């Protein structure tokens, strides 16, 4: 019972896993049990997403989020975003379910029978938070794995089957990445762009050669930096800037995981390359352009010159000119003039939307696509009825983009709050005043007059 | 001895009048530029094409406004989400036409408020305080970044961002009602409970201290002069105010602990505004509130109206009238 009440530790039951800071076996069993839950969800969710799969509706109308990640890898997907098989999705959800029963047993072993501290018996695995040679080794071992995990995407996209390119010539299909882009002016070109409109910092990767060519450089960095932090020791400036304690490392992660939290929540709203519109539904920008293109086709059949069609405001009703000079669609859709989509890029030129190609070459698969992406715009509700906020209750659709951009974005603010809580405490636990002000020695009384 | 150590000793000195700190190195230049541009853009600034339809909306005092109608207008629909600084505008006249100073004020505001928040941490470190006043200030920083930053991102334009004014605020709230149905969304519900509850427990705690004050003055002088500053005696009978509220509702609903009492005053609003500011955020990406329109039907199948159908007809009135010229196609996708 010693170590598991407030009389021994000083932590209440509600902040009860803070008792695990200075024990190492109980803490290891806790991190491998929560890893057992992350696996277990993903296995059990995909089996839930397979048993409710219907071949009639599209992949995004049925409201799934996990079997569309595997279709980007290319399992069971056909040409044009048509899921064919759904026997390989069953196979993945079982491996991520059986394995959580093993990671489950490590969480129940290491935290209920394992020694409280590993430093006594197991000198390789045992550690201290104040140690700085061991902690960069733990960082180094677990960085070479993130290097190797990045090459599994590259091995799979070049050798083992290939990945789903929505920009693939002839239609979206599983395409081997033959020649990935290895130019650091291009690959690190993304990382140093503006995050604003038009540039779109790291969201705006627009072909699979930069994706798969980019995950090469990640595997290069994470292995060399994995070996860098195994061999070396933190420098003079790095030892002066940080707090080397247990909770301080936790508030370093929570700041960085919130960076990844917002960015994955902004991939899902704008990017149509890593997240194909055939699978995740049309983006926010894409469904705004598909409306203006549909009524472009509609009134072109009425013999109307759509270029010279003067809009009600005096602008272009259909085709107008962007503030950089390009021929774009008009309306409230003039804000999304950067929309680069595989069904509109056949109509581009140097200048923009080629008027000669609009008057003559509109293919009926583009009409079937823009009418599909108008009616399945990412506009929903919490009771899962689609359309605008004033739509009647007949349809049952909320886009899987709007579930990912509103939940990982939701979490990514609270983990920014976790950077604020856990680093306020860890910086003050290092200094000694996290329990309160001393009555005998108050620091304000030994200062200047107040003014 | 060195010049840097004599500069770090000054910039982190608590003996200054206002503590500057290392966050003040990017709080003060940011917020003074957001201020000095706001005062000029609120007083003297030409009209701004907000709808991108070349219909310039006046927003400043010299162009015939007042405190209520005058507002720094958001940037154009033509720009949208693009970064539009002064040097990427080819003249200041082209900058002020297309909604220039809305981006200069907002981006220097959100940097200066996120640095004012870290500055509240820093002085708590140098004074020996436990650190987390800046976590309570995260709740209006969450809400300021929700209507100026996150909502223009998910809607894809700063023109849907909030106008820096008073009448522009209510143009923002009503158009947000028609397009997103915020009142039925449970996160505006969880922060109306945050500020109705917050103003309750404010005036409920502030009354029970002022009720149980100890006699230290006469009836001629003020009540407040019975507190000498920096005294160590407790200035109110806390057992008295506990026995009052212990009879006003019942016994077990009263905090005898003043620390757990003064924590619940910080929990309830701040959690209510964290949740609310992630209501605007999840409704920035068009995950709207509830929609119970045509939900109650008879056995024949005719729609029986509810209060949500009356609320819908108020939303349909604002939806068909907001930006009455900017639309060309039947669905407000933006």
């Amino acid at each position: 019972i010693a170590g598991r009440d407030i009389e021994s530790t000083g932590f209440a039951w509600w902040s009860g896993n803070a008792r695990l800071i200075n024990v190492s076996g109980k803490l290891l069993g806790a991190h491998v049990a929560h890893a057992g839950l992350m696996v277990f969800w993903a296995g059990a969710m995909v089996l839930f997403e397979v048993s409710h799969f219907v071949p009639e509706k599209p992949t995004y109308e049925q409201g799934f989020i996990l079997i569309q990640h595997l279709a980007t890898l290319g399992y069971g997907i056909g040409p044009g975003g048509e899921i064919t098989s759904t026997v390989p999705y069953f196979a993945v959800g079982v491996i991520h379910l059986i394995s959580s029963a093993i990671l489950g047993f490590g969480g129940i072993y290491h935290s209920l029978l394992g020694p409280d501290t590993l430093e006594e018996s197991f000198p390789f695995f045992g550690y201290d938070w104040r140690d700085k040679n061991k902690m960069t080794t733990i960082l180094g071992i677990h960085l070479c794995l993130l290097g190797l995990g990045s090459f599994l995407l590259v091995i799979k996209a070049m050798y083992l089957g290939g990945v789903y390119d929505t920009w693939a010539p002839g239609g979206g299909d599983v395409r081997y990445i033959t020649t990935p882009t290895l130019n650091p002016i291009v690959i690190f070109g993304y990382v140093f762009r503006s995050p604003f409109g038009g540039d779109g910092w790291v969201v705006s990767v627009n072909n699979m050669e930069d994706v798969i060519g980019g995950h090469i450089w990640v595997g290069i960095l994470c292995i060399t930096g994995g070996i860098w932090h195994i061999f070396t020791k933190p420098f003079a400036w790095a030892r002066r800037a940080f707090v080397w304690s247990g909770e301080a490392y936790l508030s370093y992660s929570l700041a960085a995981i919130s960076l990844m939290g917002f960015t994955a929540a902004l991939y899902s709203w704008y990017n149509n390359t890593a997240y194909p519109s055939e699978l995740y539904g049309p983006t926010g920008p894409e469904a705004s352009q598909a409306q203006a293109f549909t009524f472009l086709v509609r009134d072109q059949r009425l013999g109307a010159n759509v270029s010279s069609a003067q809009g009600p405001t005096g602008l272009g009703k259909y085709l107008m000119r962007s503030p950089s000079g390009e021929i774009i669609f008009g309306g409230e859709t003039m804000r999304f003039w950067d929309l680069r989509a595989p069904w509109v890029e056949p109509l581009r030129g140097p200048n923009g939307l080629d008027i000669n190609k609009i008057k003559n070459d509109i293919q009926p698969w583009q009409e079937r696509r823009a009418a599909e992406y108008m009616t399945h715009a990412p506009l929903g509700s919490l009771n899962s009825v689609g359309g605008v906020a004033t739509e009647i209750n007949s349809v049952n659709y909320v886009s899987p983009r709007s579930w990912l951009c509103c939940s990982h974005f939701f979490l990514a603010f609270f983990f920014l709050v976790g950077h604020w809580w856990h680093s306020g405490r860890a910086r003050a636990a290092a200094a000694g005043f996290e329990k309160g002000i001393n009555r005998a020695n108050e620091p304000v009384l030994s200062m200047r007059p107040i003014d | 001895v060195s010049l840097w150590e004599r500069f770090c000793a000054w910039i982190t000195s608590t003996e200054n009048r206002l503590y500057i700190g290392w966050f003040g190195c990017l709080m003060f230049p940011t917020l003074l530029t957001a201020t000095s541009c706001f005062i000029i853009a609120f007083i003297a600034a030409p009209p701004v094409d907000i709808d991108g339809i070349r219909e310039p909306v006046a927003g400043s005092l010299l162009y015939g406004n007042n405190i209520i109608s005058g507002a720094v207008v958001p940037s154009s629909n033509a720009i949208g989400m693009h970064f539009y600084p002064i040097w990427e505008a080819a003249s200041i006249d082209e900058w002020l036409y297309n909604g220039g100073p809305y981006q200069l004020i907002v981006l220097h505001f959100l940097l200066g408020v996120s640095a004012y928040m870290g500055r509240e941490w820093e002085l708590s470190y140098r004074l020996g305080m436990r650190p987390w006043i800046f976590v309570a200030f995260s709740a209006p920083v969450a809400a300021a970044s929700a209507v100026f930053l996150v909502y223009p991102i998910g809607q894809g334009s700063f023109s849907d961002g909030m106008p820096l004014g008073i009448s522009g605020t209510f143009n923002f709230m009503l158009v947000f009602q028609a397009e997103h149905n915020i009142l039925m969304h449970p996160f505006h519900m969880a922060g109306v409970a945050g500020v109705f509850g917050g103003s309750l427990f404010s005036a409920m705690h502030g009354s029970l201290v002022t009720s149980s004050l100890i006699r230290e003055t006469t009836e001629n002088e003020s009540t407040n002069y019975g507190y000498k500053f920096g005294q160590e005696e407790e200035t109110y009978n806390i057992v008295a105010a506990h026995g009052y509220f212990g009879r006003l509702i019942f016994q077990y609903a009263s905090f005898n602990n003043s620390r757990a009492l003064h924590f619940f005053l910080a929990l309830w609003p701040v959690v209510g505004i964290w949740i609310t500011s992630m209501g605007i955020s999840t409704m920035a990406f068009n995950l709207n509130g509830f929609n119970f329109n045509q939900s109650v039907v008879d056995s024949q199948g005719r729609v029986i109206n509810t209060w949500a159908d009356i609320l819908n007809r108020a939303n349909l009135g604002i939806e068909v009238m907001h930006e009455r010229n900017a639309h060309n196609f039947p669905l407000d996708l933006a």
Binding site: - | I43, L61, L62, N65, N66, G230
Partner: peptide, 30 residues
């Protein structure tokens, strides 16, 4: 002529904010 009153109310409000911060009655123990 009308907006001259609004400007005087605004900068006049910012004056008494300036005097309240810097010329405040500094509280003293004992």
């Amino acid at each position: 002529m009308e907006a001259l009153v609004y400007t005087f109310l605004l900068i006049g409000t910012l004056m008494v904010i300036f005097f309240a911060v810097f010329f405040r009655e500094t509280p003293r123990i004992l």
